[PDB]
């Protein structure tokens, strides 16, 4: 009883030290340094390719390393691999669950992962002697729905779940090497660092966390939102990231000065954000909304730079490609559109 | 005018009756077997069918002329 109160009081004291140490670091705001910067002109992108064939809602997509091959996951029970250059279909994979929420394409390109509402992450092998795509492993152990997965290599994967935890898996043995605990609310997304050394996660408690791949420890925790966080991505440098929420706002966080830097918001938008991705320079930030639109923001100035409007339902996923050429959107209206 | 308009009204009325009764029958028959709606149940398609059946009589009158 009394020592419960003592522990609580120590908790508020530590929180106060954190907050006043943060306030001892704010020399100025990102708007002050970037007050005089060459404004980004209006971006007028047009759709170039239209991928048809899915018959239900699309929930995730992922670009390949070569920037040609693409993977899309739909609630029709299908995982489709596209050649974006020729629009051709390379592989169609039937799914055993059909309640998918996430998919991923391996850096080596020999493997594809998917998962959702079955607490299982499934791995498929693309290069086989028999000429068909087969299941290589079924990773089990989570007690909630998968939200996002990312590859580290052929033999390392990371998953996030609705049981408020994250996991790292070795695929030869199919066991959890490390489990990441925290996040009193449901985890919705994760993003890997360019050096594959750290990763960030966003949750339904309105906060984000930074984890070290080895040692299984949480280093930094970030707050500032009023509702659930749905998407997250790293800045190309690897020293910052961005988050989108149901409060109709996006925010940017740096690591070395562990606090919020910029918030992207307006008055005409009241709907939330479903996906966020950065360009190659880091000057542009892309975000998909619930009002059937995609908005392009300028990261250094926080002004609306562009709007992409060709969709009849909610935009659910984005991708930007490794060489910076094309952006891809997948929506609830069963179509993928590529813009340049 | 007598040659063209003598049988046109009856054709109109009974083609429309046939198409609407067929629509109701197909809806209530396939409703017990599949979720998917039967094809061609909509004002545009029904009008197309009715005026095709009328066009049969129109072409016959043309040959008569």
């Amino acid at each position: 009883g009394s020592e419960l109160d003592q522990l609580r009081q120590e908790a508020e004291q530590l929180k106060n030290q954190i907050r006043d140490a943060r306030k001892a670091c704010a020399d100025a705001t990102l708007s002050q340094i970037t007050n005089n910067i060459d404004p980004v002109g209006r971006i007028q992108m047009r759709t170039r390719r239209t991928l048809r064939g899915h018959l239900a809602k699309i929930y995730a997509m992922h670009w390949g390393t070569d920037s040609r091959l693409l993977v899309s996951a739909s609630q029709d029970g299908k995982l489709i691999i596209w050649d974006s250059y020729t629009t051709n279909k390379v592989h169609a994979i039937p799914l055993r669950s059909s309640w998918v929420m996430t998919c991923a394409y391996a850096p080596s390109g020999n493997y594809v992962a998917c998962g959702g509402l079955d607490n299982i992450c499934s791995i498929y092998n693309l290069k086989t002697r028999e000429g068909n795509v087969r299941v290589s492993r079924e990773l089990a152990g989570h007690t909630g729905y998968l939200s996002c997965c990312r590859f580290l290599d052929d033999n390392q994967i990371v998953t996030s779940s609705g049981d408020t935890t994250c996991a790292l898996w070795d695929i030869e043995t199919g066991q959890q090497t490390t489990t990441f605990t925290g996040h009193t609310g449901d985890v919705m997304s994760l993003s890997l660092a360019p050096d594959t050394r750290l990763f960030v996660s966003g949750a339904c408690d309105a906060s984000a966390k930074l984890w070290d791949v080895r040692e299984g420890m949480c280093r930094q925790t970030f707050t500032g939102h009023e509702s659930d966080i749905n998407a997250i991505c790293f800045f190309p440098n690897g020293n910052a990231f961005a988050t989108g929420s149901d409060d109709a706002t996006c925010r940017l966080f740096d690591l070395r000065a562990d606090q919020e830097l910029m918030t992207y918001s307006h008055d005409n938008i009241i709907c939330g954000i479903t996906s966020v991705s950065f360009s190659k320079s880091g000057r542009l930030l892309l975000a998909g909304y619930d009002d059937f639109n995609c908005n392009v923001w300028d990261a250094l100035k926080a002004d609306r730079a562009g709007v992409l409007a060709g969709h009849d339902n909610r935009v659910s996923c984005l991708g930007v490609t490794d060489d910076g050429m094309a952006v891809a959107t997948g929506s609830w209206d069963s179509f993928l559109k590529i813009w340049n | 005018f007598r040659r063209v308009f003598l049988g046109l009204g009856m054709c109109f009325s009974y083609a429309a009756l046939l198409t609407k009764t067929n629509r109701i029958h197909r809806i209530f028959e396939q409703g017990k077997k599949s979720v998917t709606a039967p094809k061609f149940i909509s004002p545009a398609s029904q009008l197309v069918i009715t005026f095709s059946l009328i066009s049969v009589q129109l072409l016959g009158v043309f040959v008569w002329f």
Binding site: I18, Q220, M325 | -
Partner: protein, 56 residues
């Protein structure tokens, strides 16, 4: 028993969090305001590319 363990775990977590070497925000803003200038010419989303390459 579980509650006191959770409280001690949060105490340890907060004391690990509150001992980071935090740089001031001007330095971070300048560091990220300079990345784009270094990599501006290689990003074709904001600067259009001539129709020669344009895989799409």
């Amino acid at each position: 028993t579980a509650s006191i363990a959770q409280a001690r775990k949060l105490v340890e977590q907060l004391k690990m969090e509150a001992n980071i070497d935090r740089i001031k925000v001007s330095k971070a803003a300048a560091d990220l305001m300079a990345y784009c200038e270094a990599h501006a010419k290689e990003d074709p989303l904001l600067t259009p590319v001539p129709a020669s390459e344009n895989p799409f």
